[PDB]
Design a protein that fits this description.
The chain folds into 2 domains: 177 residues, Ricin (A subunit), domain 1, CATH 3.40.420; 81 residues, Irregular (Ricin (A Subunit), domain 2), CATH 4.10.470. It is built from 8 helices and 10 strands. Strands 1-4-5-6-7-8 form a 6-stranded mixed β-sheet, with helices on both faces. Strands 2-3 form a two-stranded antiparallel ribbon. The structure holds adenine. The PDB classes it as hydrolase.
């Protein structure tokens, strides 16, 4: 399994772009694509995981573990009290949990369990963060940096603190890798906090449906309209691959052949 490092504490737009490039290039299947857009592999291709190490301004780190097949964050690790501490979501199976344990913290003689005692759905994370919408949880480079320092090497912390960190890291890492539009929202706002707009949220919520729509399209025409949101919360009725492709970083895995370019 590869570990890709992103230096949050000394970040620049260019360094974030390179991070996104490296993460997409590691995660993607070596060959699968539809309409020129790289696709994630089946669940059997090895390595099955990618690690993402986030470094703050004091060189504290948190390492996220991502599933390659769907880019979900499965859990994360930090160094505390001389040990590797692994924090796994509670909706990960026993088999995958064993992988997470041993991939984040291969030294079984110096590690510690500190579970994430809730599941990894956005509805749950929002509940734990106290917000009715993750539009209300700002994203940003300084926020991500600050959040790392509230958790890494910290014995005990609240579920709210953790969920806020997870919302920010999931969106700035996995969702940005999935969607060039979201990468670009981070880059346009690189120097400030920002609230994810309706188009960010819509893309996040519809990634699986978008992959299927692109995979199924014939001669660039979607088989049925795909309704998303524009950034002003108006409806975006997508009819062709041409309209959605610029926003895409990675397609979710979809079995079967497609129009490849
Ligand atoms: N834990 C997670 N990781 C990646 N994408 C997600 N979408 C919702 N929860 C997520």
């Amino acid at each position: 399994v590869n570990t890709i490092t992103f230096d949050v504490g000394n970040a620049t737009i260019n360094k974030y772009a390179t991070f996104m490039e490296s993460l997409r290039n590691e995660a993607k299947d070596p060959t699968l694509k539809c309409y020129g857009i790289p696709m994630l592999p089946d669940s059997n291709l090895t390595p099955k995981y990618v690690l993402v190490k986030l470094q703050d301004a004091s060189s504290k780190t948190i390492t996220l573990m991502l599933r390659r097949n769907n880019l979900y964050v499965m859990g994360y690790s930090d160094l505390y009290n001389g040990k590797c501490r692994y924090h796994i979501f509670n909706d990960i199976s026993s088999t995958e949990s064993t992988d997470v344990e041993n991939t984040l913290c291969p030294n079984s003689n110096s590690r510690e369990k500190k579970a994430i005692n809730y599941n990894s759905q956005y509805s749950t994370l929002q509940n734990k963060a106290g917000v009715s919408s993750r539009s209300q949880v700002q994203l940003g480079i300084q926020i991500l940096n600050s959040d790392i320092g509230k958790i890494s090497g910290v014995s005990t912390f609240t579920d709210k603190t953790e969920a806020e960190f997870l919302l920010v890291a999931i969106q700035m890492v996995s969702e940005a890798a999935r969607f060039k539009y979201i990468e670009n929202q981070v880059k346009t706002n690189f120097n400030r906090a920002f609230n994810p707009n309706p188009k960010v949220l819509s893309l996040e919520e519809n990634w699986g449906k978008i992959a299927l729509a692109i995979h199924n399209a014939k001669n660039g025409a979607l088989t049925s309209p795909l309704e998303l949101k524009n950034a002003d919360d108006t409806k975006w009725i997508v009819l062709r691959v041409d309209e959605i492709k610029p926003d895409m970083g990675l397609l979710n895995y979809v079995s079967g052949t497609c129009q490849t370019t």
